[PDB]
Design a protein around this ligand. Structure first.
Ligand SMILES: *[C@@H]1O[C@H](CO)[C@@H](O[C@@H]2O[C@H](CO)[C@@H](O)[C@H](O)[C@H]2NC(C)=O)[C@H](O)[C@H]1NC(C)=O
Ligand SMILES: *[C@@H]1O[C@H](CO)[C@@H](O[C@@H]2O[C@H](CO)[C@@H](O)[C@H](O)[C@H]2NC(C)=O)[C@H](O)[C@H]1NC(C)=O
Ligand SMILES: *[C@@H]1O[C@H](CO)[C@@H](O[C@@H]2O[C@H](CO)[C@@H](O)[C@H](O)[C@H]2NC(C)=O)[C@H](O)[C@H]1NC(C)=O
Ligand SMILES: *[C@@H]1O[C@H](CO)[C@@H](O[C@@H]2O[C@H](CO)[C@@H](O)[C@H](O)[C@H]2NC(C)=O)[C@H](O)[C@H]1NC(C)=O
Lengths: 557, 557
């Protein structure tokens, strides 16, 4: 007879990535192995770490240096300091992600099932044990706030708040397209599994997440994908030409449906726009390789073109996508040679927290203005002809001229897609993610002392306090999307400091960035190795279109 | 109209791991990227490589230093020079294996299908193109020698030639058991595929190569495996208790069959001996963890014990298995911390050449002497009661007292298993492996100038020449098993210089050897982390048996 002692790991006693291990019935034991710190809680700093801890600048101070005084960055970008700084950004950001994946949605410990079964989403911090007092550990209330009252009172958009950095819809449809290749949650299996077993930039949203779908999408002649030429322009093939199951709506004839790598891409003109572009790019590279290598088979023309398009994707994401997102004056550079000196596992496992912080649905606008007229949400969604009605040139120019919404600060998510945020809050609770403050301590940040320190103003913090009860019990999604934005930035501090470790580890953590693959012979000679380099977003649109329209991630000024 | 020019890569023009790339119709282009050398054939040495190339000792000279003058090695083993040398052996041997796997049985080039589809055997050197003059490239005859006349005239044993190092059958049954966890060729798919997707030391031959087989083999109580206690001793469960398909012979009742991880282990008393031992070891560790962690579930008791047994396997293979095999006076040490300074991918992909050089069937003796009597091959094979008739103690002592056969030099493969060598020569030809000399140049060795330089004597070289026609056309299997043995060694030079890169890369290339996993919390506290360390072969037998018999890899002297 006893009051059933509390699980000591509910208090999160370990600090600095210390592993809480339960011993006996009520004791714990923090494993501070190579965590830099020692002691019963990994709070006593070692010699080397006490030096770096008292010399590390504030994370909000580093972002200030990278966004002011442009004259200093003009010189850095034109010397070898740029390469030397890039080696520092890639090394420091990647050290936070475990080199082999530690845990997953079923095991809160190192295990061979967590390492081998690639059908699982991995994770960085283990889940809250089911025998904790509160559903968030030891702090907060006995029942979390309402999932819909949270999304309506804080996340629902009232009026469109533009992005201060000028990010356009061409970036939004790129983000949705580029991420659906490793964010594919299986509805039949559950909320912690993925059909995208590639776990990174495999372009599974172009060639299919399996092999049968890949064969049915390929022409098997000159290594090309099946292409359907419509009134002069080249579009992806019709569904009856490439009979792979697409999630097209019922009733629309197969002459209108278009088969692509992903199953859902045919439900938006923007998602179908990029799938048309990469298919034009894929068939474009196949012509340039057959010229250099006539004595090549069908398979080698395809598998070598895949690595090239994987190469262009990693470059455009590093030097244009992340660049626009950060707003840094320091020009980012995708050079895998910068990591040849460091120990860096060229493997990646998609974490369930990365899927979480990537819900940038506030990007989407109130309506979609394609040139002359202005399509509504019900007119834009599931439109099976707008891509062919306008062509790639018109839609690319149209999306590059409309501003997207600010991410941080909250109250900027359009109400047609507010239900996605409610599924995120619900999934975050069924995965049992640790509080927002506990994830900051994992990513080198002090926890928020008050609620006003999080949101920035007094009114929103007052309601967020009575709902949760404690700042150490705030969930992961609200803290990210309700955090106060940096001045003239797209989102708050915690979005940059947590999102950057996952991105660079997922981009440079590709086998093509390894010394074994980063050769010109991998991409079929120097002709193909120079397609990976010098690859821009304009060279993706304007090299595959009849005319060259305006295409970038910012709106004209 | 033309004579259809020869494929220039049939001449293997590139040297020093240079990649032959075909350009146009008849030209080639060697990619010497980071190969150390430059020029049209990667034959012109760079500055750093010309220094190391004129200062690298002979591979037959390094083996002489490690096998003579024991007094010098007494001091090295008792100082930090042992650790410093071990860091050198692990780093230099592993640099030959590609960090991500380069090619496989279907692609002779870097490709995402070669990297992602783990159902393939990878490879180090690409295959001979189908448009080469000879089946071995450009040298040799138009038809390779007979597969059976080669195995009967050179590989077939005449009289038993013992192992000069004293390797016993306890080593042989360990080798066959330990390797069947990553050497499982799928008969239905073909000769280049594997059912052992773990690709390393996953102990899939204990817990099953899939998940359904794992569940059906587990007791799901205290994380143990289903165990069948027979007359006091603990044996693996009967097949009707763990209904997973075993390849037991037809007719024998299920009361006699025993279900284990692998399907074939029930066809030898030696294979069933180790499966009984590890099952006793697995259920032994489960008792030691439940004491330290009472508040643990069934899953964590199992998955943590798996990592411990994976840890003991890597240690016993490094410090006892490879140690006995090498005969070095330098004591080998399994310390993953020695690779924390080097860039080392803690991932492994099983190569088809590693499956090749591991055909040590000359280990098997003429007959099996179990204590008093002497069982023949037809009495030993498929014996469903000898393990229970004698117990683990008797069979372990019996196998540790009988010498095994020499591997190199040829003419030492027992005729009951000579058909395995014929399948190896046939598989080597259907995989189209490069000549034996071309694999030596890949593993830092000069090619054999003559046939006498290979075998050592005049008569065997004379017949091997008229069969093949050229020393640059000798296949991979005969060159390995017909090579002249080192003085008083188990096999020749090329077996040590090619086998060591694959082993250390496959042992240290495990995620548990990574800094992220090599913590005491991974193995459930310091109690379990010290089971991985100090784990010996005697502590595997004598800690799970009633009596402690003689158990080692050598025979008493
Ligand atoms: C280590 O961390 C814990 C958790 O934050 C600290 O809190 C103690 O938790 C134990 C639970 O077993 C309680 O019995 C103590 O009363 C708690 N202490 C306090 C001050 O609240 C613990 O103090 C930390 N240990 C050290 C040495 O700092
Ligand atoms: C799908 O998009 C097409 C155009 O891309 C829509 O058809 C146009 O609708 C506008 C109304 O704003 C008319 O002015 C045009 O004449 C139409 N053109 C064509 C070719 O149809 C269509 O209505 C959209 N479908 C849905 C369901 O909204
Ligand atoms: C590079 O390696 C090749 C292959 O060993 C050498 O052999 C030449 O191969 C080409 C095939 O295109 C023939 O036309 C030449 O006649 C071969 N040369 C000789 C001497 O046999 C080639 O010589 C090497 N190149 C260099 C510069 O050493
Ligand atoms: C399987 O092995 C058992 C013993 O492990 C064999 O049975 C023994 O055979 C010997 C003959 O050398 C007899 O002297 C023993 O009395 C037998 N003991 C038992 C318990 O049967 C058996 O013959 C073997 N089976 C085959 C097919 O060879």
């Amino acid at each position: 007879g006893a009051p059933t002692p509390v699980n000591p790991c509910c208090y999160y006693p370990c600090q600095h990535q210390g592993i809480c291990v339960r011993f006996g019935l009520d004791r714990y034991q923090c494993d501070c192995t190579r965590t830099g710190y020692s002691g019963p809680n990994c709070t006593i700093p070692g010699l080397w770490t006490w030096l770096r801890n008292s010399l590390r600048p504030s994370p909000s101070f580093t972002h200030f240096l990278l966004t002011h005084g442009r004259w200093f960055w003009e010189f850095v970008n034109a010397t070898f300091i740029r390469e030397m700084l890039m080696r520092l950004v890639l090394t420091v950001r990647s050290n936070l992600i475990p080199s082999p994946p530690t845990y997953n949605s079923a095991h809160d410990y190192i295990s061979w099932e967590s390492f081998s079964n690639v059908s699982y989403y991995t994770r960085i911090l283990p889940s809250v044990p089911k025998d904790c007092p509160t559903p968030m550990g030891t702090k907060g209330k006995k029942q979390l706030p309402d999932a819909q009252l949270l999304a309506r009172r804080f996340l629902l958009r009232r009026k469109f708040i533009p992005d201060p950095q000028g990010t356009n819809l061409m970036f939004a449809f790129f983000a949705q397209h580029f991420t659906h290749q490793f964010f594919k949650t299986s509805g039949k299996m559950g909320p912690g599994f993925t059909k995208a077993l590639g776990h990174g930039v495999d372009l599974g949203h172009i060639y299919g997440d399996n092999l049968e779908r890949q064969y049915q999408l390929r022409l098997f002649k000159d290594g090309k994908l099946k292409y359907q030429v419509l009134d002069g322009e080249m579009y992806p093939p019709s569904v009856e030409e490439a009979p792979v199951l697409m999630h097209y709506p019922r009733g629309i004839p197969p002459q209108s449906q278009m088969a692509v790598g992903q199953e859902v891409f045919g439900l938006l003109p923007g998602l179908m726009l990029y799938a048309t572009l990469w298919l034009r790019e894929h068939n474009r590279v196949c012509d340039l390789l057959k010229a250099e290598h006539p004595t090549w088979g069908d398979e080698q023309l395809f598998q070598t073109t895949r690595l090239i398009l994987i190469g262009e994707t990693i470059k455009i994401v590093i030097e244009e996508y992340v660049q626009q997102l950060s707003g840094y004056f320091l020009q980012l550079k995708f050079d895998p040679e910068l990591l040849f000196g460091v120990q860096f596992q060229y493997r990646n496992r998609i974490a369930m927290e990365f899927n979480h912080l990537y819900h940038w649905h506030p990007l989407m606008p109130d309506s979609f203005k394609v040139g002359s007229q202005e399509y509504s949400y019900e007119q834009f969604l599931f439109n099976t002809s707008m891509l062919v009605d306008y062509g790639v040139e018109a839609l690319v120019d149209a999306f590059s001229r409309q501003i997207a919404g600010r991410i941080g600060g909250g109250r900027n998510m359009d109400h047609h897609i507010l239900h996605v945020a409610v599924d995120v809050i619900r999934e975050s609770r069924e995965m049992r993610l640790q509080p927002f403050n506990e994830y900051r301590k994992r990513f080198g940040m002090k926890p928020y002392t008050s609620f006003q320190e999080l949101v920035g103003e007094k009114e929103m913090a007052a309601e967020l306090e009575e709902l949760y009860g404690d700042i150490d019990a705030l969930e992961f999604y609200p803290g990210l999307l309700l955090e106060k934005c940096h001045p003239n930035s797209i989102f708050g501090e915690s979005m940059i400091e947590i999102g950057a470790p996952f991105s660079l580890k997922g981009l440079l953590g590709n086998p093509i960035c390894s010394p074994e693959y980063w050769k010109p012979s991998t991409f079929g000679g120097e002709v193909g190795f120079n397609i990976v380099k010098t690859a821009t977003l304009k060279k993706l649109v304007c090299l595959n279109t009849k005319t060259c329209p305006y295409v970038s991630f910012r709106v004209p000024d």
